[PDB]
Amino acid sequence: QCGQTAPLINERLSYMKDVAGYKAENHLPIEDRIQEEKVINSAMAQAESLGLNGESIKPLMVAQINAAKAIQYRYRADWLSQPEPGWQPKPLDDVRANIGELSTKILEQIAEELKTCKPAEMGDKAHFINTIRQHNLTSADVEAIFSTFNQVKLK
Amino acid sequence: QQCGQTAPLINERLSYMKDVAGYKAENHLPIEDRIQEEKVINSAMAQAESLGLNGESIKPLMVAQINAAKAIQYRYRADWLSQPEPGWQPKPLDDVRANIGELSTKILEQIAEELKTCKPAEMGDKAHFINTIRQHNLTSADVEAIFSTFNQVKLK
Structure with a gap:
């Protein structure tokens, strides 16, 4: 719906331990x-x-x-x-x-x-931070996503 | 200074690894x-x-x-x-x-x-290695593996 983008961003990252593991084995x-x-x-x-x-x-x-x-x-x-x-x-x-x-x-x-x-109704930084939460992910990592997310524009 | 002097050297070796990481990232x-x-x-x-x-x-x-x-x-x-x-x-x-x-x-x-x-007994112990081998981005588990192998080294 609205404010639903950050949860999807977080789901994508939940796959990275599998990518890392597979890369590590090989x-x-x-x-x-x-x-x-x-x-x-x-x-x-x-x-x-x-x-x-x-x-x-x-x-x-x-x-x-x-x-x-x-x-x-x-x-x-x-x-x-x-x-x-x-x-x-x-x-x-x-x-x-x-x-x-x-x-x-x-x-x-x-x-x-x-x-x-x-x-205005679009997600603030505290919501982004609460939502995008993964082991091995830092605040700066989440912040670079947040700051780039806000510069996306229609055209 | 004769016994317990290895860890300082191991620590200094590991102080160069930020440069190696930077060389690799650059390239x-x-x-x-x-x-x-x-x-x-x-x-x-x-x-x-x-x-x-x-x-x-x-x-x-x-x-x-x-x-x-x-x-x-x-x-x-x-x-x-x-x-x-x-x-x-x-x-x-x-x-x-x-x-x-x-x-x-x-x-x-x-x-x-x-x-x-x-x-x-005169040589570095587990706690000496931890307290001596400290670098940004290096954990206690990383140092403990170094300590345990260090003790595996023998003369011959």
Whole structure:
């Protein structure tokens, strides 16, 4: 509905421990440029169709990808000295399709929220902070998302 | 100063890892580079040889030190994504790595000396390692792995 974008942003990040685990098992680097460019390109296409700038959307996407990598980097660090036996990563392709599906709802939701309800009723920083909550995610990570989110514009 | 002098060296080795992390981030390079790790392990094992250390007894310590170093680097990569330290600049890699290798030698020389001359009571204990090996982005679990492997190193 309205104020529903931040919960979807948070759901996307809940998948990053699986991405990190899978990458860790297979000794894959966290940063995958071709995967990030695919993410950034589908978002731009989708944003274009929905009547969003387009250019205003890229920083939000980069903010989300950076948050997601920061989560992954800190799992890789922690697992060196504190492996998690019980953690069995889901297959990366499945997790990636769940992540893509969410990015897709995030953009739909941003367009809908922008086209209707007034950015006074749009989420404040304390709501963003309460909503976007993940182990290995810091306030600065959430803040870079919040600040980019508020600069998304229709066009 | 004869016994309990290894930890300060291990700490100084790990103070260079922010520069290595910065070099890697700048170049979009992965933190983990197994070629470089085998090289560091193989050199340490050959030095251990010249110092009267058992070569194979040294590898766990090298593994533990490399893990701590990666842990630090990973943590830096994460932080800079949202908080990027502009005009802190990493030192040139080759200079950083020579310093690291130098410290790596000193650590092995110090361990060999201590093992020859000291009781394992005069040498660093678990609490000494924690209190001495402190760096931003390095945890107590990272240091405890280094301590336990350090005690696995033997003469021969």
